[PDB]
Design a protein around this ligand. Structure first.
Ligand code: G2P
Ligand code: G2P
Ligand code: GTP
Ligand code: GTP
Ligand code: MG
Ligand code: MG
Ligand code: MG
Ligand code: MG
Lengths: 437, 135, 432, 432, 431
């Protein structure tokens, strides 16, 4: 029994949390009251759910927001019975889309309170693997509070795995002009504290909904139900008796070659609208080829313009090894898939028999097989580059900086944060070159 | 034209293995603590001190504005007061200068009529040397 | 960020204030007795922002009614929604400022002030999570201008961590109550620059011109102009008083709109422009609604946005419409008019769609813009002030109250500096 | 609160007082005994425990003749004996006697009664002083009173109704002396002063009311109608009101330039029947024609510095703004370059009341324009010349010197008039 | 300003004084017993100016009767209104000055003076608001001239704040063969210039000429001349005796008429000129009244107003007439004769209209003018004085009484200076 503690910070984190936990429940047969009909019986589900004396199953999770609106919905909603009041934490006033206000001013008021419940939950654990942190790069809570939390977690839980699910900002759904500031300031503060982090580009999700799910104007409900699918695909092997990424340590070992380059790219397939004419289910070959198509990526970038340093294929459902090896063979003939000098050109492949699950009445159609490729490519540097430029445009004129300095931040911190981004960008370049000897 | 499969793990909910298309091209090789809680507190409390400082500085300026507000209200009091003081001394000096002039105007006008009486009796003396020192 | 404390100062403040209160009360399903009678849970979801829930069913505006002249108190109470307001929240003095900013700011206003701050304190301490303040007033008179600015300063001291938002009405010779408006306005702007976080520049020159030119009203009245004001106020406060993602509180709105502290003067816009009598007319499409962002004809401030550049813009669409169309149109406008948006503030145009339309229209759009073009409004006030000050005309009324010529010199200088700053960023290039 | 205290000095002041107070009573429904079966009339009338209403007024004269008529007349019951003050011997049309010799005897007595009327005031606005320039009481006693009022009541608003002398009705050759000495002594003590030229009134009665030989009764009934239009904004609560402070602020640009021109319209003889009803536009335009002016001068040749328009009766704001717009388009009507907008408006509900058996006809609406024009300098110039002609030969000076006055005082007075004349010139020069 | 203290000195003073008293008593409805029997409240409104009410439904003139000759006391008591005066007020000596100003002013007159001041004091202290004094006297005799000027001086000392008004009758060789009159007159004028505020110059040369030329009276008598005097006195006092705005008191009249202190000698005018016990009928029209009243033929002083310029003018119209017409006519006269009014005293012509006409006329006009033309009357007295003084004729009549030749030299000088002043303003230009 190797437990995982999930932390959801700010509106984005809490709402994706709601999608994730709703999906986990469906995947494990747990009803919204926590009651699981175990009546006729793999136990691995316990890495994510504590059991009570009543026989009910409680998520090893904490929901934090500097504001009560979103969590107040959780406590009146369908799953209000699943979570204990103590694990749903709220302040009265948000960080006003300002990293400073989240990290320095408002954050300090609730930090000890949050670590206290994390401590509690960190006890009911007979072999803690680490933490799964869900947050937006853009908002003041998701940026400012998360970076503050990550820092104290490193102190209290010295060298214990900390993994992120970070929402990369898209202008289509963006609510604040200052998101590039908060993005860079949080990335800088968090960098040394996170072991591995899966970025979810809101424009990528938005476009997949529009294209594959035929959604004219995608909503956070549509985005999150999609995100959840990938998150479930990633966490499956921890929550079921898997063989690949069976522990968090494995993620890091399997995908992170260097401490700073810890941002793997996620690609999921197939994404099909539920409200469409019946179709002859997709083959292992069809779904595999889809992993090398940028239209299915979780972050908008071009892996042609990059080199792989680690690749992982997570097959779900009706998948046979012979069909997977056949699919990989075909790809190599037709496509380059450049790796770095140091790594072998290949893939770590895991099959999880548990079929893919869908929220009934959802946008996604139920499939007999699916796949999520996790790949550490130098091409992800393109996502930092876009954000870094937007930062540069505003910082040159010090636009909005007074909001940050006003909350006790120093102008030098922006320089420090950006210099570290400049170094991260250079590290992706340096890593893609020839080795010597 | 050639591939290598390395079986990794077999379990209840699935199996894992590694596929090698080509080995690495290159074969010959390509931490900083911590942070302290005391260091976190130091940085957190430095910001709190810069924030409390700029709020205080702001409050000091609103305090300067009030001190000025009392001053203009004070100026208006001193102006209405000096106005009263000019008006009082002016009107008094004018009332004194007039009483003065006016009294003197009569002083001479009676003094001229007093000369008349002095001369009338004086004329009666000139007649005395004639009237009965006569006939 | 829940409750907002609303304040109305002077005749204009109270006139525009009452109008806002009747407009939003209808939108929220509140009749003049404070009783809710609507049919949408969306109406009450964020009612707490502007209303305090009173004993039983009833709702009471969190409004404070202020004036040095007692008459306006009765003018309000006699109004349609007069009996909705808390009787205690009526703070009225005995003698008006007599169109003199010095009297309202230093003499007769400094009185009424504390007694007003006690009402705000009573409202404020009652709040679970006070957002801040919303003041309505004119810059032309002596109460709204002089005293209103004193209030802002006294509130700022007591509540330095709260948002100070104002609906400041700008004077115009085209529709005026006093010969001294340039003095009163200049002295007020100086105070607004230093003490507010967000100010809506409602220009009477702009409203007169809308009524006269567009609406074809030969002789516009304060009713005709307040019809445009109420529309605008309803639009700019849609995000605050209904659930939504964008600029939902006063601080998040300030963070998205204010890049430099002093540059906090918004140019409100509105489409369609209608007359109190224009009881027709069935129309307006999404591209039709969108085109009016650059139409100077639609600005509540007397400046051409094409004469400057947008630092930041907020756009609110109301009524049932395709968000795809809205997003498409909104992109089309920015991509085709790239020369009126500063290149150095990426994605500076944020858009929101409220399903609930205002009364009278089936579809509407409100525009809140931080444009550098606002320097034209300040230049106009400045020239008017110079015309008078150059000759020291009417100055004795001001100095009589204890003010110095220096205070006038200082108020003008700050306004010239404010314009000089907008010009600085207007020219500013996104090149290294 | 906000009460006005009226002081009626000399024969002219007392008699106009009689007309005014008779008209106020009619306008408020107060019977000659002080009984009455708004609320704003309380700014002009104190109430007793008996329920009777008493004018906040004092009547002063150095001779008992005129005030003795008041105390035996129709309204003898309206005023308390204590507020009707009389001496035994008048100032013999000599300023020096009204100011020094005779005036000194009753000054303390009058200020005592004023101090008592001020004691019954919960928020005194100021004083309204009625006097002739010509008489020895009107000239000398008023200047002495003004001076004493400045001491006892500092900077408190003091406003005059001065009767400018006409030879047609003039009773003393020395009126230009008395006029200059009083203007000089009063200048610094008055905030605003409305002059009424007797030749202007005389001519309006002759022309408009068809009176062959106008009497003081005819003149005063007309003056009373203007004085009422000026006080209506204080005695009633209309659509727009102007207080004493507001007058000074909107009509006085500089302390010395405090002499607005009064113009009233319409003036119709109580005969005809077809002569009505005149529109807001018609009555407004009439304020700009010299045949309706209260002081004989030509504004065509001068420039306006401020204009105040006091409407009464059936008057709507829309109609007033329409009328002002048309004036703002008239090239013939020039304003100074230091005045972006020189207008101020007031509107009262009450049509002008007429004294039954009077000369004036009933009208549905009327207006009184108070305008500050450089053209009023023509009235000082005529008086200054008459002074010069006599002073050059020292004609009549001995009458003044005899009462303790100094010859150098006459030069001071004239030098100050020479400066006043130059100030009207300087102010019209529009100017770098 | 209510009460006026009236004084009559010498034969002339008493003769004209009695006549004034009977004239105004009739106008005010008072019969010789002092009892009021009129029928107009206007008659009594300002009765207090000249009459004391005194315990009893009757009215008593505030008049003091004076002379150094006893005869006149009886002459007045025998007159129609003789029994109206207070018996106590009759102050009469035994001597008679024998046309010696020195006797009247220094000798015999100084002896009676205190006894007179006794009566004025009693009258004056009785007044609620004393206006001042009104003396009637001749300048040609010893009592009226000499004692009258001593009286003015002594009353001036006791009451320095009051108005001193005189009706001074000027001597003429046409009416009196008395050779010393130029001396007496000259010595009196000197005193009048210094001690009076307003003097009506009633000239016997003018009255004789009116009676002889206009009235066609071959041999005019004091009765004939006094008829013109009474008419004039009734007119000039109308504003004082009846309610009205213009020159209603002695001081307000002085302020409007006297621009320079010494130039206080008024030229009175009357229209229509009539003889005693004469009923026209046919009352003059308004233009008739306005023109006639401005002729030299209508002046009670022997000067042509067309020979000089008016400093100030007061015009009183009596009877029922249109004030419009009066005002029109009055403007017409001063716009057409602009060369006779000083340009430097704007609006120097004031007019009043009393509804109550004098007895005998249905319409009349009185003119009070401060004209520079009055220098002709003073030049006439001066030439007559020099003719005599040059030869020191009669000087022992005065030196005998204790006077000096210097008192004479000084009196003449002041009169030459007075003329010289009127000439100064006659020539004076406005510019
Ligand atoms: N859009 C509107 N502007 C107005 C209105 N009333 C006045 N004003 C404008 O406001 C300024 C005049 O001000 P007020 O009535 O507000 C003066 P206030 O009553 O605040 O103070 P006082 O000096 O004590 O009278 C001026 O620009 C008027 O032209 C209104 O109802 N609507
Ligand atoms: N119009 C009139 N003039 C008169 C009258 N009696 C005298 N006179 C004139 O007055 C001057 C002479 O004077 P009087 O009789 O008055 C002298 P009086 O009696 O005052 O003093 P004595 O010297 O003691 O006689 C002279 O010019 C006479 O000609 C009169 O009744 N009427
Ligand atoms: N995919 C997705 N993105 C979200 C969601 N909610 C917010 N975002 C995005 O996250 C950013 C805003 O951050 P939020 O989490 O909403 O703000 P916050 O953490 O609450 O911080 P505050 O400013 O204190 O309110 C923008 O990029 C939003 O589009 C969500 O439910 N799903
Ligand atoms: N309009 C008007 N003017 C008047 C009236 N009475 C007098 N006048 C004018 O005012 C001046 C007269 O001075 P008065 O007011 O009568 O003199 P006084 O104030 O009583 O001063 P005294 O000399 O001491 O009597 C002249 O210009 C007259 O024409 C009146 O009732 N109405
Ligand atoms: Mg939030
Ligand atoms: Mg007001
Ligand atoms: Mg008077
Ligand atoms: Mg004799």
């Amino acid at each position: 029994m190797r437990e995982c503690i999930s932390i959801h910070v700010g509106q984005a984190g809490v709402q994706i949390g709601n999608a994730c936990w709703e999906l986990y429940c469906l995947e494990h047969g747990i009803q919204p009251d926590g009651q699981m009909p175990s009546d006729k019986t793999d136990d691995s589900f316990n890495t994510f759910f504590s059991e009570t004396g009543a026989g009910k199953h409680v998520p090893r999770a904490v929901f934090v927001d500097l504001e009560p609106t979103v969590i107040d919905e959780v406590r009146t909603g369908t799953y209000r019975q699943l979570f204990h009041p103590e694990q749903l934490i709220t302040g009265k006033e948000d960080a006003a889309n300002n990293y400073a206000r989240g990290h320095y001013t408002i954050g300090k008021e609730i930090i000890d309170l949050v670590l206290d419940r994390i401590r509690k939950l960190a006890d009911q654990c007979t072999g803690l693997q680490g933490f799964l942190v869900f947050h937006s790069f853009g908002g003041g809570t998701g940026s400012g509070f998360t970076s503050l939390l990550m820092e104290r977690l490193s102190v209290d839980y010295g060298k214990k795995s900390k993994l992120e699910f970070s929402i990369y900002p898209a202008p289509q759904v963006s609510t604040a002009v200052v998101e590039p500031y908060n993005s860079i300031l949080t990335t800088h503060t968090t960098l040394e504290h996170s072991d591995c982090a899966f970025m979810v580009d809101n424009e990528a999700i938005y476009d997949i909904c529009r294209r594959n799910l035929d959604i004219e104007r995608p909503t956070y409900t549509n985005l999150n139900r999609l995100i959840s699918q990938i998150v479930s695909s990633i966490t499956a092997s921890l929550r079921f008796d898997g063989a690949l990424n069976v522990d968090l340590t494995e993620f890091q070992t399997n995908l992170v070659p260097y401490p700073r380059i810890h941002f793997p790219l996620a690609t999921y397939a197939p994404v099909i609208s539920a409200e469409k004419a019946y179709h002859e289910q997709l083959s292992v070959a069809e779904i595999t080829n889809a992993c090398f198509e940028p239209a299915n990526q979780m972050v908008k970038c071009d892996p042609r313009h990059g080199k792989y340093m680690a690749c992982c294929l997570l097959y779900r459902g009706d998948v046979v090894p012979k069909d997977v090896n056949a699919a990989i063979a075909t790809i190599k003939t037709k496509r380059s898939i450049q790796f770095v000098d140091w790594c072998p050109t290949g893939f770590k492949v895991g099959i999880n028999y548990q079929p893919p699950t869908v929220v009934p009445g959802g946008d996604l159609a139920k499939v007999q097989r699916a796949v999520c490729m996790l790949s550490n490519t130098t091409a992800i540097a393109e996502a930092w580059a876009r954000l870094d430029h937007k930062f540069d445009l505003m910082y040159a004129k010090r636009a909005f900086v007074h909001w940050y300095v006003g909350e006790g931040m120093e102008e030098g911190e922006f320089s420090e944060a950006r210099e570290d981004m400049a170094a991260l960008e250079k590290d992706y370049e340096e890593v893609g070159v020839d080795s010597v000897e | 034209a050639d591939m290598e499969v390395i079986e990794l793990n077999k379990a209840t909910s699935g199996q894992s293995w590694e596929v090698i298309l080509k080995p690495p091209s290159f074969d010959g090789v390509p931490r900083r603590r911590d942070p302290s809680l005391e260091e976190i507190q130091k940085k957190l409390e430095a910001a709190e001190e810069r924030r409390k400082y700029q709020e205080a500085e702001l409050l000091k300026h609103l305090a300067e504005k009030r001190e000025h507000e009392r001053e203009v209200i004070q100026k208006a009091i001193e102006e209405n007061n000096n106005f009263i003081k000019m008006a009082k001394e002016k009107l008094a000096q004018k009332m004194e200068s007039n009483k003065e002039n006016r009294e003197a105007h009569l002083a001479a006008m009676l003094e001229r009529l007093q000369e008349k009486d002095k001369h009338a009796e004086e004329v009666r003396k000139n007649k005395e040397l004639k009237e009965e020192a006569s006939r | 960020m829940r409750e907002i404390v609303h304040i109305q100062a002077g005749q204009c403040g109270n006139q525009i204030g009452a109008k806002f209160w009747e407009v939003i009360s209808d939108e929220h399903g509140i009749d003049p007795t404070g009783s809710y009678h609507g049919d949408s849970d969306l109406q009450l979801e964020r009612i707490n922002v502007y209303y305090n829930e009173a004993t039983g069913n009833k709702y009471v505006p969190r409004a404070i009614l202020v004036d040095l002249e007692p008459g306006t108190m009765d003018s309000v109470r006699s109004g349609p929604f007069g009996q909705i307001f808390r009787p205690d929240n009526f703070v009225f003095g005995q003698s008006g400022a007599g169109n003199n900013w010095a009297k309202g700011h230093y003499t007769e206003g400094a009185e009424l002030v504390d007694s007003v701050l006690d009402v705000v304190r009573k409202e404020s301490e009652s709040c679970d999570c006070l957002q801040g303040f919303q003041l309505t007033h004119s810059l032309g008179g002596g109460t709204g201008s002089g005293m209103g600015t004193l209030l802002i300063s006294k509130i700022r001291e007591e509540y330095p961590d709260r948002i100070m938002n104002t609906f400041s009405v700008m004077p115009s010779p085209k529709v005026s109550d006093t010969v001294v408006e340039p003095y009163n306005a200049t002295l007020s702007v100086h105070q607004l620059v230093e003490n507010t976080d967000e100010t809506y520049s409602i220009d009477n020159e702009a409203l007169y011109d809308i009524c006269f030119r567009t609406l074809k009203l030969t002789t516009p009245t304060y009713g005709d102009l307040n019809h445009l004001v109420s529309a605008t106020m309803s639009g700019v406060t849609t995000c605050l008083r209904f659930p939504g993602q964008l600029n939902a509180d006063l601080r998040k709105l300030a963070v998205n709109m204010v890049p430099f502290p002093r540059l906090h003067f918004f140019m409100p816009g509105f489409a369609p422009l209608t007359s109190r009598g224009s009881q027709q007319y069935r129309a307006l499409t999404v591209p039709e609604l969108t085109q009016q962002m650059f139409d100077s004809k639609n600005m509540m401030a007397a400046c051409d946005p094409r004469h400057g550049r947008y630092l930041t813009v907020a756009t609110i669409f109301r009524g049932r419409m395709s968000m795809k169309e809205v997003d498409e149109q909104m992109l089309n406008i920015q991509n085709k008019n790239s020369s009126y948006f500063v290149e150095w503030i990426p994605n500076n145009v944020k858009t929101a769609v409220c399903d609930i339309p205002p009364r009278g229209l089936k579809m509407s759009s409100t525009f809140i813009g931080n444009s550098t073009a606002i320097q034209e409004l300040f230049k106009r006030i400045s020239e008017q002030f110079t015309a008078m000050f150059r000759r020291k005309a009417f100055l004795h009324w001001y100095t009589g109250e204890g003010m110095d010529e220096m205070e006038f010199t200082e108020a003008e200088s700050n306004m010239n500096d404010l314009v000089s700053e907008y010009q600085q960023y207007q020219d500013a290039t996104a090149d290294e």
